[PDB]
Amino acid sequence: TEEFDAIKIALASPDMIRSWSFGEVKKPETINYRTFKPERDGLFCARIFGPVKDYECLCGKYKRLKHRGVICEKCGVEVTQTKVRRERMGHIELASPTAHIWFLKSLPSRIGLLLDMPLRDIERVLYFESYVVIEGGMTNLERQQILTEEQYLDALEEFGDEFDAKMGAEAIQALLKSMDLEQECEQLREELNETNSETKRKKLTKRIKLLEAFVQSGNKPEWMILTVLPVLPPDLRPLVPLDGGRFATSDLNDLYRRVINRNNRLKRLLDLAAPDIIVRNEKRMLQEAVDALLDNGRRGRAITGSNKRPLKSLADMIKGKQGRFRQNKRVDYSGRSVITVGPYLRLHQCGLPKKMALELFKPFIYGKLELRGLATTIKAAKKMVE
Amino acid sequence: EIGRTTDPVRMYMREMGTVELLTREGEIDIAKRIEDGINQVQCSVAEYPEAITYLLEQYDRVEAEEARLSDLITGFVDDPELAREKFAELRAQYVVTRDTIKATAQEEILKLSEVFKQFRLVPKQFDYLVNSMRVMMDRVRTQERLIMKLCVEQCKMPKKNFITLFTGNETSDTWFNAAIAMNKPWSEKLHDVSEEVHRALQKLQQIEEETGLTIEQVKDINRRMSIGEAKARRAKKEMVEANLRLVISIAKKYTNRGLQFLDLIQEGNIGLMKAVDKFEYRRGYKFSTYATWWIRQAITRSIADQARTIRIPVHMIETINKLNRISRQMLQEMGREPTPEELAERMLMPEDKIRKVLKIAKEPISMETPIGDDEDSHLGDFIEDTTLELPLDSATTESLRAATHDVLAGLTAREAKVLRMRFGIDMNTDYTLEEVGKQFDVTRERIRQIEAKALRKLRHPSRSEVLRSFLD
Amino acid sequence: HARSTGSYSLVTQQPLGGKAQFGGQRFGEMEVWALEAYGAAYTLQEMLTVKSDDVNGRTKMYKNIVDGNHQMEPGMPESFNVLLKEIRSLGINIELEDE
Amino acid sequence: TPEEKLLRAIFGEKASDVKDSSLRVPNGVSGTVIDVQVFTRDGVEKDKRA
Amino acid sequence: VMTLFSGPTDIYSHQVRIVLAEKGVSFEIEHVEKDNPPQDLIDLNPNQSVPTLVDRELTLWESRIIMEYLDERFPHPPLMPVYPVARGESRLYMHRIEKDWYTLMNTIINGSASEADAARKQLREELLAIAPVFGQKPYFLSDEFSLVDCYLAPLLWRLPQLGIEFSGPGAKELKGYMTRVFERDSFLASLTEAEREMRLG
Amino acid sequence: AANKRSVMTLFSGPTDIYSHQVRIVLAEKGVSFEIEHVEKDNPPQDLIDLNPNQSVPTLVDRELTLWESRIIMEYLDERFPHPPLMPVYPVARGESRLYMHRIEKDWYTLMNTIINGSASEADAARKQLREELLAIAPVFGQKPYFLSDEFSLVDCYLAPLLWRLPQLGIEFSGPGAKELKGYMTRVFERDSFLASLTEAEREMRL
Ligand SMILES: [Zn+2]
């Protein structure tokens, strides 16, 4: 790759998260239990994250070196390298929106101070405990009054139109979606001057500095409410088979199965038309499972099943182990031993045992034994050093 | 009252138990509401003269096998045994009732349907009848929704006035002349677009003929039926919110099976939502002793579906659970422990299926289980990977192309090309001999010879001296 | 112990010992500050690109060595490409400019 | 592979049906084999040494 | 993700649609205005010529290139010969019809009513010349539908809109063709509403 | 007749690049082809009667004539396969048919226009032609050929249209012509080119 520079980072819109993925993951199952080939449309697919064995379809109709780019018609695997099973992505299509637990519960609530809403009220709306108004018009209600279950119901009998109250994660997508960062930007450029308070006109310049970021950056506000959650590639959360029959799954195939299952049921209750005591309990139950995936622990700590330690979500993988996940690198060509004295050496030399130096400098030694003609080929040099 | 509670189970109970338990006579009261509910619906399909149209082809093909004896009838109310008579009892009033308007024009068409009340239908096609007249709305609705825009936002006409004469009828010339007659600019402008406003509602003119009646009767046919379903929607909901306390009592026995508590009692709801769907009260059995089956039915079907990572089928979990119900019973009697063969005697498996059922049920160890001493290490740091290849295994295949490009270059020219085309050496897919023979243009069994004697030459020594060295 | 080439881990492609060839040493965070103190910046690049983590930049550095051509083509480590797939799997979008 | 598939035809080295994964002594060790024990699943014949 | 910048009416865009709907490719089409899609598809297409394909990494125009791609990548059912002898036949036969007949229909639409008569009848005698040859196979020199007929099925569908027809000779062995090919679901589910009302089918 | 042998039949053009494009792929596969440098005023008889479209070149092998060089140089690359000239992967094979179409419709008409254009168009063509041919200059550093490290047909579409460089009055100029000019040292003297080049087209090289 070319001499890049300037890693650039920004929010991700549902029309882009739909652009990384190669297909929709629409079942919770992983493999087959009888022949361990992975199932179709499940988490570990082959039509989605590429093939399993290098250069061959899944059924077994395309193995020859003639067919090297075609996609099989039986099971639509593309016959390419199994390395590409490591850099593709899927995506789940949420049946209802849900707040991004980072941009909702990080201490300065980026959903909060973008709306000027106390965080204890947003949380009272994301659990479906208290209605919230949208577009009040000509009535006795602002744009963000918090009508409790009665006050709305004691308000709804009078007005039927010119008025809209919502509740839940699909409400904050309504507040953000209609709010405009230019009207309340310059209109707050005046409001800051009138205010005479060392605390008021000090936090007041904090909000107006956030609105001034959501415009030049190019991020709309309503992208902090997810609508298509993207799934990792199936070789960074492996299901490798141990020796003896047991498998050693990563702790993400326990969390992804818990979103695709709950999201799959909530697709059903809207077709079976259950009452709003259950489906309203479904979204409240889904949204706790998407936020147990991003950063598990800022909630009831959904501990692992079949065991008693907490699961390890995505944001608990970058998070410090005292340092980074990348390079802040175990290393080849190394060794270690017990040091001793050896006081006959010069200042610029150290001992090194024959049994070690013959093991670090192996690829160099292979050069001489094939350069001086002592070994015909490299396989015949590996047996001369052994 | 919202004392900073977080977990939903606190929020479920706090929201669920506001409602009150129903007395037994209350339950019969509610079911009698639904029982009038669907009767408002199905009796509001007899009003639809096309009610037998979707089925008259069935019985005109049931004998002739385009319909089966199950999905349309189940035993009439209040088989060649009954179908050949009751539907045959309809062949009299069938066309004779539509005879009048071929005045009592609506009595006969009603008289056919008036006796239709004793005709029993089946859950298969009941949906389609509701799906039939439903889309006729959208076929008439959005057209009528355009009548406003086509007359208001295009002619400047007001909307709330012309509807008085044309809505419901949907076919006459009400605003054709009555709207135009008022001497307004929009009315005189009505003659401008008077065709599209007249032609857009043409396909609905098929609709009234589609059921043969007027658009007025079609309105009450589809609209009066809607109250019947909504009569039951609020009815069924009243029973799901009432006995909702029950599922929590039935779903606590399964609290630890790999499924969360709150994913359990949501599975019972889809169960209990079906029980009251199929509930019948006339047998006298209280709702609890019938809803307890359909509820526990679900939570034992859900656990076999989404409890394992590597999912095992539903018919197998009955066999695994049988192996512990029986390997536990032999544990007390026998006292010591059970053997791999005594289960074969106690049960009736073929002595090896009990050896394949044992290599299944084990769950996957999590790849972050901290290994011994609880050091700064997990299990995922010790599982090497085998897809890769030894760089001395790749350094040979790179070296092998040296010999086969050099050794095979030490041949003749025309005899080396076919030696390279006969394998995939330095090329695409390999080839067939006479598939190659159309390349050298001498098509014969020579091609099986030229390679044949040439490959002998490389077989000789000192031409294979470097090539032999790759063996072992 | 001593190791010239052996196994490689599963998710991240660095070395470890399960094949009678234990992992390499731990070139931890404390030991990279002792290679930036000196100006040593060619030793530091190969010590975390070719010798450990790159996927096809090291299978060349083993075939250059056997031919006597000590010279490397670094490439980008495979432990950074997992850090883009692990950030994109949140809402965050991460990329690289072009110039 | 294609190149080696010519290497077989030249010498006729029969490809084996079975792969070798025997147990070999770890490197850098030497000492007599003082004891051997054999465990067999009940249902498979005992070989001569067993 | 496989999108197509289909034309609403032009036979070229109707060409690719038969290949897609035949093979079973999951595709989504984005329509052009009349024969112009937006000015926004010039970035992935410096020619701004439809049709144009975009499958997640790739850009292709000049359906000669497109159609052989979908045939070479989605293998079955195949739309070409098997051995190199006959592929030159099909690859050349389609070069005939795309050279003689297709540009011949230019002045029948974009040529004045004077030259419209010129292309009309001079083409018609060609139309029934190969007509008796349909007594050799079902399709245009094939016992199973292939790429070579892909230029005729969208071609024959334009007959009544242009104004040429069959009358006695040229209709017996010929009209059996269109009644055999116009029923295949591939050509069935390819028919767009704009290209349908040209004829009664 | 023409097809009456077990060998080809080609009625080439002695100056027309349609032949000379076909010549390289014709001989690069090592087949024995009949050359016939014929004219439009007087071609060979068989070129007139059996060729109901009457173009140049024209290949004829036991079944029928073939023309329209993309059809010709495809029939040989699909029937006489070794060595290969086109990739395996239908992704990289698509665009490899795409660059050729972006040369016969992009850098061909600059040759015809310079053959029948006005005095400024011969500069306007030479203007649009010469500078843009330097626009693709940095390509050759990454790849020893046109974005395909093996010799393939997309390169054969260039060299015959790079062998008529000064023939229509052209010369390169600017920074980095050594990269493209040094590249011409890597392709203009290959066996498939050296044995295939017609001496009639060579004399413009002095
Ligand atoms: Zn397959």
From TrEMBL, chain B:
One of its GO terms (biological process) is DNA-templated transcription initiation. GO terms for cellular component: cytoplasm. It is found in: Cytoplasm. It comes from the Bacteria. Residues 407-460 are annotated as: Sigma-70 factor domain-4. Residues 239-309 are annotated as: Sigma-70 factor domain-2. Residues 263-276, 432-458 form the RNA polymerase sigma-70 domain. GO terms for molecular function: DNA binding; metal ion binding; sigma factor activity. Residues 433-452 bind DNA. PANTHER family: RNA POLYMERASE SIGMA FACTOR RPO, RNA POLYMERASE SIGMA FACTOR RPOD. Sigma factors are initiation factors that promote the attachment of RNA polymerase to specific initiation sites and are then released. This sigma factor is the primary sigma factor during exponential growth. Belongs to the sigma-70 factor family. RpoD/SigA subfamily. Interacts transiently with the RNA polymerase catalytic core. HAMAP family: Sigma70_RpoD_SigA. This is RNA polymerase sigma factor RpoD. It comes from Escherichia coli.
